Design an enzyme around this catalytic site. Structure first.
Site, PDB file in Angstrom:
ATOM      1  N   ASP A 163      -2.566  21.017   9.283  1.00 22.06           N
ATOM      2  CA  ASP A 163      -1.218  21.338   9.736  1.00 22.06           C
ATOM      3  C   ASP A 163      -0.172  21.070   8.646  1.00 22.06           C
ATOM      4  O   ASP A 163       0.814  20.369   8.882  1.00 22.06           O
ATOM      5  CB  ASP A 163      -0.883  20.555  11.003  1.00 22.06           C
ATOM      6  CG  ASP A 163      -1.989  20.613  12.032  1.00 22.06           C
ATOM      7  OD1 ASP A 163      -2.549  21.701  12.243  1.00 22.06           O
ATOM      8  OD2 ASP A 163      -2.326  19.559  12.615  1.00 22.06           O
ATOM      9  N   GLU A 339      -0.152  28.158  19.332  1.00 22.42           N
ATOM     10  CA  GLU A 339       0.415  26.895  18.866  1.00 22.42           C
ATOM     11  C   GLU A 339       0.886  27.066  17.421  1.00 22.42           C
ATOM     12  O   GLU A 339       0.868  28.167  16.866  1.00 22.42           O
ATOM     13  CB  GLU A 339      -0.608  25.764  19.042  1.00 22.42           C
ATOM     14  CG  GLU A 339      -1.841  25.925  18.161  1.00 22.42           C
ATOM     15  CD  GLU A 339      -2.900  24.877  18.421  1.00 22.42           C
ATOM     16  OE1 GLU A 339      -3.897  24.841  17.666  1.00 22.42           O
ATOM     17  OE2 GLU A 339      -2.736  24.085  19.368  1.00 22.42           O
TER      18      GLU A 339
END
Ligand SMILES: [Mg+2]
Ligand SMILES: [Mg+2]
Length: 472
Positions: A163, A339
């Site tokens: 991420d 997401e």
């Protein structure tokens, strides 16, 4: 000899350091000189490959093992000291591109950490090998404080960080936050070049609570500079349910976020309480927006993408608006999820990429587009491209790419995508606990129709992302 830092392979925020003459690995090493060493020709043998590890602050003091425990000790001129303080530099036991240190007098034993203490042990297991592998960061390494207008990287730039969020600030530094494999802390690093993120010394700026809220999984932090202050938006579960995740904010008004004091501001509340994660923020035409992922109990998806207007950096106002929910087959492999939203403004449009499907090799990215003159709080302003825009590629050996961010070259002229992926396909066990998503970067190309062309994930190795053009 050569001044160097010795960074752990499996705890890459941690460095071999002098701890008042004991020797351990630590993060947040203060003073920084405690982690600085001079690699000199071996005291017991100056032949090629043999080294001794001397303190920079305490010249004449070297790492020396005794009863298999390391201390920083003054050279007494004896042969036994020299032998206990000499090592052969060999290819890394866990990865031959890294370094391991084999004892001169006990050649079946290697420098390793255990319970963060430095030891000299035989190396048997795969975990032993990781504990005995180190990255030597020396004067030949990229200097994170040196500027360069060209963008050349070696992928993976940062191993075992997922991420990846990269933010180019107005001080001439990129700042990077990311999910760490233990999901237990917020890590920050900075570099004037993307490649220097590889060698930059990270800092742990916040660690999770021991009980209650902010005590579960710590996911996907993003650092932003808004109205003269730093903010970190992050996702955190609780100590009794690691997945009961909400959005939280830290604030730092000190100008250097690596030295400054961070304060908890609490939960960034949305319209209802549920699994909420992956928040980002952008500004357009005088309005700031939050974009994030959240579970709606009434929809059989793990999370959908929402947008809302913000009232300053700490809160939303009004109704949140769902702008994407998983519906194509490629959004639902393993489970249905949208997401990791990321915002890119160009060519009169707002582009929002998002990630979908499970976090194994099936992970991929889609694209939402709105006209930048449209009502961004109307769901029908947002259009999902019908196919993934970035996905696994067997020919380049990159699997499950996603949860990206967007940054630029230092001169602002090109857009660069930073994202994670694995360099193998098959995963053993729960993919959340496979730590090998690595941070990497490549150019964003632009189609003549105004839309981004993300291409395919580049193979590992050197990638020339950007060379600045020159006026004739
Ligand atoms: Mg010791
Ligand atoms: Mg993000």
């Amino acid at each position: 000899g050569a001044i160097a830092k010795l960074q752990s392979y499996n705890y890459s925020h941690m460095y071999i350091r002098n701890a008042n003459f004991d020797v351990r690995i630590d993060d947040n090493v203060t003073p920084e000189t405690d982690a600085q060493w001079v690699l000199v020709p071996g005291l017991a043998n100056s032949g090629e490959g043999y080294v001794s590890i001397q303190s920079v602050d305490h010249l004449g003091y070297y790492l020396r093992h005794w009863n298999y425990d390391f201390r920083l000790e003054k050279n007494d001129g004896t042969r036994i000291f020299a032998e206990d303080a000499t090592f052969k530099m060999v290819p890394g036991l866990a990865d031959p591109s890294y370094t391991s240190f084999q004892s001169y007098n006990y050649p079946t034993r290697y420098i390793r950490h255990y319970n963060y203490l430095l030891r000299l042990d035989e190396i048997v297991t795969a975990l032993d090998r990781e504990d005995a592998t180190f990255r030597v960061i020396d004067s030949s390494s990229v200097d994170p404080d040196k500027a360069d207008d060209s963008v050349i990287v070696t992928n993976p730039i940062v191993r075992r960080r997922a991420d990846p969020w990269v933010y180019r600030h107005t001080d001439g530094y990129y700042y990077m936050t990311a999910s760490v494999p233990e999901y237990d802390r917020i890590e920050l690093r900075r570099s004037r070049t993307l490649q220097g993120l590889s060698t930059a010394t990270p800092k742990t700026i916040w660690r999770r609570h021991s009980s209650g809220i902010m005590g579960g999984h710590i996911w996907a932090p993003e650092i932003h500079f808004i109205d003269g202050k730093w903010y970190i938006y992050f996702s955190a579960g609780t100590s009794t349910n690691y997945f009961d995740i909400r959005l939280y904010v830290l604030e730092c008004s000190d100008s250097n976020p690596l030295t400054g004091t961070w304060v908890e501001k609490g939960q960034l509340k949305t319209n209802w309480e549920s699994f909420t994660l992956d928040a980002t923020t952008f500004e357009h035409n005088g309005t700031r927006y939050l974009v994030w992922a959240q579970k709606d109990p009434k929809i059989a998806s793990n999370s959908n993408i929402y947008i809302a207007k913000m009232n300053g950096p700490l809160a939303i106002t009004g109704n949140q608006v769902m702008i994407s929910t998983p519906e194509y087959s490629w959004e639902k492999i393993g489970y249905a999820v949208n997401e990791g939203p990321a915002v890119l403004k160009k060519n009169g449009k707002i582009f929002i990429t998002f990630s979908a499907s499970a976090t194994d090799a099936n992970y991929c990215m889609g694209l939402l587009t709105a006209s930048d003159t449209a009502n961004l709080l109307d769901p029908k302003s947002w259009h999902k491209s019908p196919n993934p825009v970035f996905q696994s590629n067997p020919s380049t050996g990159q699997y499950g790419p996603g949860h990206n961010s967007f940054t630029t070259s230092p001169d602002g002229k090109v857009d660069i995508m930073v994202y994670h992926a694995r360099n193998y396909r098959d995963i053993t066990g729960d993919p959340l606990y496979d730590p090998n998503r690595h941070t990497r970067a490549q150019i964003v190309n632009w189609n003549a129709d105004g839309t981004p062309d993300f291409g395919i994930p580049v193979a590992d190795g050197t990638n020339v992302i950007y060379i600045p053009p020159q006026t004739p």
